[PDB]
């Protein structure tokens, strides 16, 4: 016989777990973490800084 | 004064009726006419309090300006206003 | 505002000291005068005169405690003892006088030790109060079992430290405190300038430590 | 022309008619007098001017009259109200003396009259002690008024003699160490007069203080005495009447801290919240609401007592009254222990409330349930309201 | 895996950056108005009502 | 805001259910805490991580009570909404349900408030609820309840005049304008240190915790350990560091020595404990000392590492309290001398006890390992010796942890039978959260 | 002077009141800081929050630069 808390426990904690999964795997990457906003902007700055450091040498 | 003061007064009237029942050993829903009268009185009491809010602000600005404290017109609207915040 | 990387107010500071904030159109204080006895009682340059000026007030506390104990002893006296009026008077006056003399002694010891360490060190700080408290509490705690010859110097030194922090250092630190008018060093925020500091009819224990805090009187 | 004095003539005519109506009703053998009480409440409304403090006193006394049943008690309360109202308008020591003495005589007679059962002699004893202690304070007031009148030649309340008049006022509020008459009164006199004594005269005297009083002195030592003595006494006394007497001394010490630092707005807010709590305290029949009085007299945050204490603390910190504030905070920490004792006594206990048998079924549930809604007043208290 | 792409599109469609800025500005404005009002109110004089010099500008009529 | 009013009003309807319908009362009170977990998960979905520091703002006029979300508040709110239904599974009366519902309202509103007076009003309105929860008549302790209430009241009463001092100084208690005005930082800094050094157990104002966290019931212990201690940390991170930073630099040697002596002396005391619940209760003081020093270092990513340690502690120590609560519920004692050989008689419970023992000692594949490494990175960047003190004392934590486990789990088999389905599902969300946050915490 | 500081504060409040931005740009990821000669930038709260957002952006970008260079050096 199913205990009184079992449907509500499985619905609540399972819907939290699926929601946390969808936060990690279906949000836009810039919206999920600022490191995805800054990864392309660091790369172009590094491109225009590597040749500056080349010329300084 | 505050925009939601009448709804707060109605919740106060409902809690008043429920407590008057609980003190006399009755369940919360008993004698609903007591709840209704309490709701009416709470609504009008908290609306009167919200009117006194505007009245007190008006008295403060009037007394302060008569004493010589000149308030700029950008700040006089914080006081001389029946603001429904 | 709030990030896990850093706390921006921990490195966003002024580069220069500020000018004094104008708080009112009138910048002179209004207050009742201090009586001359308390003006003389503040002077520490003569250690003996300091102790003579301060010790009778500390003896008043022992007078109050002794009068209390004397009345409570008088009420319990049986009629065979209470009708003997000379003996009753000498017993009650003995209780009161012992309490008054002990309080005056502790007060004079504290004031003299305080002003002596003050004049010996050449500066005013919290060390003189701590040393005077240790001496007075050791005088009180002598002859008692042993938590007490340490516990009573600590209590009297703690009273001196609380006196310095609450009554002297905190009013000095907050001399530029304003509750009215422009925010201090934030005059660009535009809070209006009143014609005067606010008039408050406070009691004699609440007096303005700066001329601009409020005007006291009626 | 006497056309500006119709309210005074109305007061006197109403008293003349009310005595005759009460005489006619008693010649019929009426064992209840609700009609007399309604006429008394109408007379209270009809003689009160249109100020905030006057109507606060009026509405308070209208609510208080529902706990009194005899004709003579109603007459004494009306003639005490005349002194309480007209003391707020007193601008001399003549009217001050007469209003205070009328109030003292009315309180003494009511303490004698209303006692019943085995507690009759205890109430009469405490009334006699109060009368004797009140007589010498009245003598001090008269003596120093005569001194001031001789020195100044006028009726102005200025100079060194105002210190003794201030001590007279502090006696009338039960300020420690002149507090023991109220401690004696709390232990024996019945609950309705205790309810009357903790609300109306404090309002009347503080309004006189706000309206027409200046002194060049301090009250700080009496603040310290009241707060420390009240807190330690209520911690140490197991009888509940003495607990509430000492907690009242602590509250009057807080009100004196509000007076001493100026800022009477915090004084008026805390006094109003205290008066509503008193109206709840002395009319309780269900003992679970005794815990709400406890959490709202301990200053616990969401209830209205917190707000009443906290504006007093805010204004004291504004004018930098640091030492008195620190003492007040220590005594507030001590007060929580005996308010928790109250909660232990009356909340963590099985519930028993006896029903009525001879009618009048739980007759003041309206007022007590209305005053318990001091959990909804904090929304209006946080705003700039009382100024 | 298409559900993930459509939920990403749903996030981008629902988010409104200008509305976030207006929310921030309204928060700052309400707080600043409260602070300004409270600072003006705190010039709070206190004497007795019979002080005719501290209350010299009030229009008071006496009956005596 | 409208949602929060609806959730409060739905939660408060437990009182109106007639008590003879037992199943309905249980289901209603459990669902009343399940719903805020879904709402806070949705708030995490709605959060823009490349946007502003404060999002989802609301301010209620001139009543103080202004609210906003940052990362620390959001993680702590998620942890609280996880922890409250587990507490609902450990209660049996409507009085318990209502006390925990009121506590959840107050905790959730206190975690995200942006007003100092609002924080004061919301937090210590829970004092009388904690007094009644700890000093319950047949099985509580009134001494413990008096201690926790009086220590908290003492700290709050020190703060309250300094709160009002800055309010008169600038005109507001809103943290966004308190951080931009000129204020007397020494006085307010001492008031804020006074509250938050009692909330976080910092020596010498820490003696309430060993009494209160043991005298509480299992649900009360889960709440008090996993949630209420972290209000001091979020107090540091939200109010004290932004508003009084000069004080926060100048008090660093004093806060530093308080943290070091709290860590060392509380670890030394934990070794001589003979009660299992007192063993679990002391170990929380050293973790909070590491949290406080990492917050006060302000050095590399200090808010991040300290919040992550708060979450790792809030996951691991309630599970240890749950296992001790199972042992107490079905053996009626918490004394070590009555327990031996629990591996043979409760294999599942002993396995869970071992895993959470390893988690509490900051072993890898648990979020405490990542947390302590990053906290020591933040501490190391100020000076190497302040990190060395915590590094060399790791044998002292492992000594008490493995000694308690080895005394109660191995030996002659005596004691209760293994866990039920309900006890396993009280433990289970904490274990899943630990495995996730210790293996793949970020993306 | 006080008048010049007040007029500057009014100008800043007017500018930040009537501010908007669209087309793929996040406010609170600004392109440039606001250059000022203020003693204690927290004198003007809008400028303080703007430069706080810019400084947060730079810290995260520098972290990302470190990661890209570490991958290159490993290669
Ligand atoms: C067409 C539709 C028909 C109308 C329906 C009206 C409702 C029934 C009212 C019954 C009644 O009049 O007598 C009851 C009852 C007397 O009947 P009983 O049961 O035989 O008497 C019991 C005792 O013996 C009592 O003995 P007694 O006879 O001596 O009692 C006298 C009674 C008075 O009753 C009477 O004498 C007659 C009643 C009026 C009759 C005419 C009305 C029609 O005493 C009172 O004054 C009762 C006081 C209770 C509270 C009243 C308000 C207090 C305000 C103060 C503020 C508190 C809250 C503020 C919140 C706090 C904020 C800080 O009288 C009352 O209790 C009166 C209370 C108020 C009545 C007005 C209600 C209006 C509000 C709307 C009602 C909403 C429900 C609608 C129902 C339909 C859909 C569900
Ligand atoms: C010209 C001036 C005219 C007279 C004004 C002053 C006299 C007021 C006396 C009064 O209302 O008598 C109560 C009397 C009810 O007494 P009862 O029903 O014979 O006694 C039943 C028991 O007391 C048990 O019933 P209960 O305790 O539930 O009710 C007691 C009574 C009043 O109970 C209370 O004293 C508690 C009410 C708390 C509200 C206080 C309002 C103050 C708020 C301040 C806002 C500024 O109930 C009411 O709330 C009746 C209010 C009727 C209108 C009042 C105007 O009300 C009336 O009969 C109507 C009087 C209104 C004018 C005629
Ligand atoms: C101070 C930063 C906050 C970090 C706190 C530590 C969090 C603990 C766990 C670490 C997880 C890292 C998650 C990273 C991606 C998630 C989204 C994200 O970016 O985080 C949010 C907030 O993240 C969270 O809220 C994480 C929630 C963690 C709480 C998990 C514990 C609760 C679960 C219990 C177990 C449930 C099991 C149920 C299954 C049966 C914002 O933080 P920042 O990126 O620093 O914000 C940027 C700053 N600015 C806007 C100014 C540019
Ligand atoms: C009851 C009526 C009077 C209540 C007045 C309360 C004033 C403050 C007292 C101290 C605070 C206590 C709060 C505890 C709340 C949780 C709780 O236990 O609720 C109660 C009931 O509490 C309530 O009144 C809940 C409703 C009020 C709060 C929610 C609505 C307003 C927000 C549940 O019922 P029992 O405890 O079984 O009741 C038996 C009573 N006795 C202990 C005396 C044996
Ligand atoms: C006295 C009343 C009780 C104590 C005070 C409670 C105050 C309300 C709780 C906190 C309110 C803010 C919630 C946090 C948040 O970010 O809310 C925003 C987002 O809304 C939400 O998603 C709110 C979620 C609420 C639940 C999450 C936990 C917060 C507190 C929980 C309270 C109820 C818990 C019930 C537990 C049984 C605001 O949405 P809005 O549309 O009103 O604001 C946008 C704009 O500025 C217009 O004003
Ligand atoms: C089932 C779990 C399967 C693994 C999921 C996983 O590792 O995801 C992490 C988040 O965890 C989670 O999302 C775990 C949530 C569910 C709890 C455990 C079940 C990090 O996500 P990632 O590194 O794969 O994300 C990259 C896209 N940005
Ligand atoms: C009882 C003792 C009182 C006493 O001798 O006090 C001296 C005079 O103060 C007084 O007694 C001042 C009161 C004099 C009458 C007014 C000052 O005492 P001291 O400074 O000589 O104490 C040196 C101890 N270390
Ligand atoms: C815990 C907190 C501290 C508790 C005790 C505080 C004691 C000192 C109180 C104090 O200095 O406040 C004074 C209040 O008047 C007074 O307290 C006047 C006391 C006069 C001395 C009494 C000497 C014995 C008299 C006979 C016994 C009577 C009882 C004495 C205990 C005046 O403060 P301030 O003006 O210096 O503040 C300046 C800053 N705003
Ligand atoms: C619903 C309650 C339960 C029902 C039972 C009713 C109980 C009886 C009636 C209440 C008794 C308590 C009232 C105590 C007195 C408080 C009011 C005193 C007046 C006061 O505060 O000052 C006025 C502010 O008024 C204000 O607006 C003050 C606001 C209210 C203060 C009370 C706060 C607690 C509620 C300002 O006077 P002004 O500036 O006009 O004066 C200048 C000309 N002289
Ligand atoms: C009492 C509540 C606090 C509990 C802990 C107190 C520890 C002592 C304070 C240490 C402050 C640091 C310090 O010494 O700096 C002082 C700064 O002055 C100041 O500004 C002194 C402020 C210190 C007290 C602030 C705490 C108030 C909390 C609320 C109290 C309740 C209301 C107020 C009565 C004076 O430096 P120095 O003299 O050593 O420098 C020597 C060179 N001159």
Curated annotation (Swiss-Prot), chain D:
<feature type="transmembrane region" description="Helical">
    <location>
        <begin position="93"/>
        <end position="113"/>
    </location>
</feature>
<protein>
    <recommendedName>
        <fullName>NADH-ubiquinone oxidoreductase chain 2</fullName>
        <ecNumber>7.1.1.2</ecNumber>
    </recommendedName>
</protein>
<keyword id="KW-0813">Transport</keyword>
<feature type="transmembrane region" description="Helical">
    <location>
        <begin position="265"/>
        <end position="285"/>
    </location>
</feature>
<dbReference type="GO" id="GO:0005743">
    <property type="term" value="C:mitochondrial inner membrane"/>
</dbReference>
<keyword id="KW-0496">Mitochondrion</keyword>
<feature type="transmembrane region" description="Helical">
    <location>
        <begin position="38"/>
        <end position="58"/>
    </location>
</feature>
<keyword id="KW-0520">NAD</keyword>
<comment type="function">
    <text>Core subunit of the mitochondrial membrane respiratory chain NADH dehydrogenase (Complex I) that is believed to belong to the minimal assembly required for catalysis. Complex I functions in the transfer of electrons from NADH to the respiratory chain. The immediate electron acceptor for the enzyme is believed to be ubiquinone.</text>
</comment>
<feature type="transmembrane region" description="Helical">
    <location>
        <begin position="310"/>
        <end position="330"/>
    </location>
</feature>
<feature type="transmembrane region" description="Helical">
    <location>
        <begin position="128"/>
        <end position="148"/>
    </location>
</feature>
<feature type="transmembrane region" description="Helical">
    <location>
        <begin position="289"/>
        <end position="309"/>
    </location>
</feature>
<keyword id="KW-0830">Ubiquinone</keyword>
<keyword id="KW-1133">Transmembrane helix</keyword>
<keyword id="KW-1278">Translocase</keyword>
<dbReference type="InterPro" id="IPR001750">
    <property type="entry name" value="ND/Mrp_TM"/>
</dbReference>
<feature type="transmembrane region" description="Helical">
    <location>
        <begin position="163"/>
        <end position="183"/>
    </location>
</feature>
<keyword id="KW-0249">Electron transport</keyword>
<keyword id="KW-0679">Respiratory chain</keyword>
<comment type="similarity">
    <text>Belongs to the complex I subunit 2 family.</text>
</comment>
<feature type="transmembrane region" description="Helical">
    <location>
        <begin position="59"/>
        <end position="79"/>
    </location>
</feature>
<feature type="transmembrane region" description="Helical">
    <location>
        <begin position="6"/>
        <end position="26"/>
    </location>
</feature>
Curated annotation (Swiss-Prot), chain F:
<comment type="similarity">
    <text>Belongs to the complex I subunit 4 family.</text>
</comment>
<keyword id="KW-1278">Translocase</keyword>
<dbReference type="GO" id="GO:0042773">
    <property type="term" value="P:ATP synthesis coupled electron transport"/>
</dbReference>
<keyword id="KW-0249">Electron transport</keyword>
<feature type="transmembrane region" description="Helical">
    <location>
        <begin position="335"/>
        <end position="355"/>
    </location>
</feature>
<feature type="transmembrane region" description="Helical">
    <location>
        <begin position="247"/>
        <end position="267"/>
    </location>
</feature>
<feature type="transmembrane region" description="Helical">
    <location>
        <begin position="308"/>
        <end position="328"/>
    </location>
</feature>
<dbReference type="Pfam" id="PF00361">
    <property type="entry name" value="Proton_antipo_M"/>
</dbReference>
<dbReference type="InterPro" id="IPR001750">
    <property type="entry name" value="ND/Mrp_TM"/>
</dbReference>
<feature type="transmembrane region" description="Helical">
    <location>
        <begin position="279"/>
        <end position="299"/>
    </location>
</feature>
<keyword id="KW-0812">Transmembrane</keyword>
<feature type="transmembrane region" description="Helical">
    <location>
        <begin position="114"/>
        <end position="134"/>
    </location>
</feature>
<dbReference type="GO" id="GO:0008137">
    <property type="term" value="F:NADH dehydrogenase (ubiquinone) activity"/>
</dbReference>
<keyword id="KW-0830">Ubiquinone</keyword>
<feature type="transmembrane region" description="Helical">
    <location>
        <begin position="27"/>
        <end position="47"/>
    </location>
</feature>
<keyword id="KW-0679">Respiratory chain</keyword>
<feature type="transmembrane region" description="Helical">
    <location>
        <begin position="362"/>
        <end position="382"/>
    </location>
</feature>
<feature type="transmembrane region" description="Helical">
    <location>
        <begin position="148"/>
        <end position="168"/>
    </location>
</feature>
<dbReference type="GO" id="GO:0031966">
    <property type="term" value="C:mitochondrial membrane"/>
</dbReference>
<feature type="transmembrane region" description="Helical">
    <location>
        <begin position="93"/>
        <end position="113"/>
    </location>
</feature>
<keyword id="KW-1133">Transmembrane helix</keyword>
<keyword id="KW-0472">Membrane</keyword>
């Amino acid at each position: 016989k199913t205990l009184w808390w079992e449907p509500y426990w499985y619905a609540g904690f399972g819907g939290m777990g699926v929601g946390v999964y969808l936060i990690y795997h279906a949000k836009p990457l810039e919206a999920l973490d600022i490191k995805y906003w800054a990864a392309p902007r660091a790369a172009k700055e590094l491109e225009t800084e590597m040749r500056m450091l080349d010329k300084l040498n | 004064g505050w925009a939601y003061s009448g709804e707060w007064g109605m919740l106060a009237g409902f809690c008043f009726g429920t407590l008057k029942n609980v003190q006399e050993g009755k369940a919360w829903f008993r004698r609903p006419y007591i709840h209704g009268a309490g709701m009416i009185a709470g609504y009008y009491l908290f609306k009167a309090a919200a009117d006194w809010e505007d009245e007190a602000l008006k008295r403060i600005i009037t007394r302060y300006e008569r004493k010589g404290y000149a308030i700029p017109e950008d700040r006089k609207e914080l006081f001389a206003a029946n603001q429904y915040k | 505002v709030f990030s896990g990387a850093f706390n921006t107010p921990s490195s966003t500071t002024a580069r220069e000291p500020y000018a004094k904030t104008k708080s009112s159109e009138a910048e002179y204080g209004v207050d009742t005068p201090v009586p001359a006895s308390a003006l003389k009682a503040a002077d520490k340059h003569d250690a003996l005169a300091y102790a003579v000026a301060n010790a009778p007030l500390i003896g008043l506390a022992g007078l109050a405690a002794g009068a209390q104990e004397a009345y409570m002893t008088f009420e319990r006296l049986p009629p065979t003892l209470s009708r003997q009026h000379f003996k009753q008077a000498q017993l009650l006056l003995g209780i009161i006088g012992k309490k008054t003399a002990y309080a005056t002694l502790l007060g004079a010891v504290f004031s003299f030790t305080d002003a002596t360490v003050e004049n010996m060190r050449g500066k005013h700080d919290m060390t003189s109060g701590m040393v005077a408290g240790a001496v007075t509490g050791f005088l009180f705690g002598m002859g008692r079992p042993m938590p007490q010859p340490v516990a009573w110097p600590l209590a009297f030194a703690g009273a001196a430290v609380a006196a310095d922090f609450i009554g002297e250092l905190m009013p000095k630190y907050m001399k530029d405190y304003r509750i009215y008018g422009p925010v201090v060093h934030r005059e660009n925020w535009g809070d209006p300038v009143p014609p005067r500091p606010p008039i408050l009819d406070t009691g004699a224990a609440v007096r303005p430590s700066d001329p601009g805090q409020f005007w006291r009187g009626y | 022309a006497a056309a500006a004095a119709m309210i005074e003539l109305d007061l006197c005519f109403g008293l003349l008619l009310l005595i005759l109506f009460g005489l006619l009703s008693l010649r019929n053998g009426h064992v209840s007098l609700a009609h007399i009480r309604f006429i008394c409440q109408c007379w209270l409304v009809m003689i009160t001017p249109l100020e905030v403090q006057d109507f606060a006193l009026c509405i308070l006394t209208v609510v208080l009259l529902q706990s009194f049943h005899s004709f003579e008690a109603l007459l004494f309360l009306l003639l005490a109200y005349i002194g309480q109202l007209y003391m707020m308008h007193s601008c001399n020591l003549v009217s001050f003396y007469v209003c205070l003495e009328a109030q003292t005589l009315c309180v003494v007679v009511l303490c004698g009259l209303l006692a019943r059962g085995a507690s009759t002699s205890f109430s009469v004893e405490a009334a006699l002690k109060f009368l004797l202690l009140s007589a010498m304070v009245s003598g001090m007031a008269l003596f120093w008024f005569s001194a001031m009148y001789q020195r100044t030649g006028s009726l102005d309340m200025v100079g060194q003699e105002t210190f003794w008049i201030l001590l007279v006022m502090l006696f009338k509020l039960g300020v420690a160490p002149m507090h023991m008459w109220s401690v004696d009164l709390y232990g024996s006199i019945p609950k309705s007069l205790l309810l009357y004594l903790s609300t109306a005269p404090k309002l009347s005297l503080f309004t006189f203080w706000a309206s027409s009083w200046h002194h060049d002195f301090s009250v700080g030592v009496f603040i310290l005495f009241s707060m420390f003595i009240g807190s330690i006494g209520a911690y140490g006394q197991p009888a509940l009447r003495s607990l509430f007497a000492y907690s009242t001394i602590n509250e009057i010490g807080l009100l004196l801290l509000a007076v001493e630092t100026a800022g009477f707005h915090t004084l008026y807010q805390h006094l109003g919240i205290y008066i509503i709590t008193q109206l709840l305290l002395w009319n309780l029949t269900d003992k679970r609401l005794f815990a709400l009085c406890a959490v709202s007299l301990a200053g616990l945050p969401p209830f209205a007592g917190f707000f009443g204490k906290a504006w007093i603390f805010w204004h004291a910190m504004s004018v930098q009254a640091f030492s008195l504030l620190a003492a007040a905070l220590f005594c507030t920490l001590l007060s929580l222990v005996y308010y928790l004792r109250v909660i232990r006594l009356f909340w963590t206990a099985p519930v028993h409330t006896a029903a009525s048998f001879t009618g009048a079924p739980n007759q003041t549930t309206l007022t007590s349930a209305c005053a318990v809604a001091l959990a909804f007043a904090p929304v209006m208290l946080v705003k700039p309201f009382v100024i | 895996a298409y559900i993930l792409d459509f939920l990403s599109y749903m996030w981008e469609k629902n988010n409104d950056d200008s509305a976030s800025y207006k929310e921030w500005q309204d928060f700052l404005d309400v707080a600043e108005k409260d602070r300004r009002r409270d600072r003006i109110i705190a010039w709070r004089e206190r004497t007795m009502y019979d002080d005719y010099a501290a209350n010299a500008e009030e229009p008071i009529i006496y009956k005596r | 805001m409208f949602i929060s009013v609806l959730l409060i009003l739905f939660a408060l309807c437990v009182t109106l259910i007639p008590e003879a319908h037992y199943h309905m009362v249980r289901v209603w009170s459990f669902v009343a805490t399940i719903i805020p977990m879904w709402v806070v998960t949705w708030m995490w979905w709605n959060f823009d991580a490349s946007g502003h520091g404060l999002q989802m703002l609301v301010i209620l006029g001139r009543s103080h009570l202004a609210f906003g979300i940052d990362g620390v508040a959001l993680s702590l709110m998620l942890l609280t909404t996880v922890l409250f239904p587990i507490c609902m599974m450990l209660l049996r009366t409507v009085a318990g349900f209502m006390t925990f519902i009121l506590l959840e309202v107050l905790v959730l509103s206190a975690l995200c408030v942006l007003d100092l007076l609002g924080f004061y009003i919301l937090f210590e309105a829970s004092l009388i609820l904690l007094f009644l929860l700890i000093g319950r008549a047949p099985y509580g302790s009134l001494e413990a309840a008096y201690k926790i209430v009086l220590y908290t009241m003492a700290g709050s009463l020190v703060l309250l005049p300094t709160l009002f001092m800055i309010y008169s100084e600038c005109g507001t208690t809103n943290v966004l304008y308190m951080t931009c005005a000129y204020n007397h930082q020494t006085v307010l800094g001492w008031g804020l240190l006074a509250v938050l050094a009692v909330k976080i157990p910092l020596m010498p104002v820490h003696l309430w915790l060993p009494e209160a966290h043991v005298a509480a019931p299992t649900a009360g212990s889960v709440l008090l350990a996993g949630v209420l201690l972290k209000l001091g940390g979020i107090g540091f991170l939200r109010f004290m560091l932004p508003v009084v930073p000069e004080f926060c630099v100048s008090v660093f040697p004093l806060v530093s020595t308080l943290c070091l002596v709290s860590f060392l002396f509380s670890t030394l005391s934990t070794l001589r404990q003979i009660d299992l619940k007192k063993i679990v209760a002391y170990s929380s003081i050293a973790h909070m000392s590491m949290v406080t020093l990492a917050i006060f270092s302000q050095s590399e990513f200090s808010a991040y590492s300290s919040s992550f340690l708060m979450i790792a502690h809030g996951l691991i120590s309630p599970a240890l309290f749950l296992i001790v609560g199972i042992l107490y519920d079905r053996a009626h004692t918490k004394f070590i001398l009555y327990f031996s050989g629990l591996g043979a008689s409760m294999p599942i419970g002993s396995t869970l006890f071992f895993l959470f023992t390893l988690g509490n000692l900051a072993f890898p594949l648990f979020p405490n390992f990542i947390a302590e490494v990053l906290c020591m990175v933040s501490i190391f960047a100020v000076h190497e010796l302040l990190a060395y003190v915590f590094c060399v004392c790791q044998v002292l934590g492992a000594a008490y942890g493995f000694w308690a486990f080895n005394r109660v789990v191995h030996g002659l088999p005596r004691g209760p039978a293994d866990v039920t389905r309900t006890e396993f599902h009280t433990v289970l969300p904490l274990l899943i959260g630990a495995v996730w946050l210790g293996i793949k915490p970020m993306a | 002077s006080v008048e010049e500081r007040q007029s500057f504060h009014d100008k800043v409040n007017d500018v930040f009141k009537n501010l908007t931005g669209e087309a793929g740009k996040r406010w609170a990821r600004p392109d440039e800081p606001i250059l000022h000669t203020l003693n204690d930038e927290k004198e003007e709260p809008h400028i303080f929050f703007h430069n706080t957002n810019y400084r947060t952006s730079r810290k995260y970008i520098n972290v990302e630069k470190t990661k890209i260079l570490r991958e290159q050096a490993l290669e």
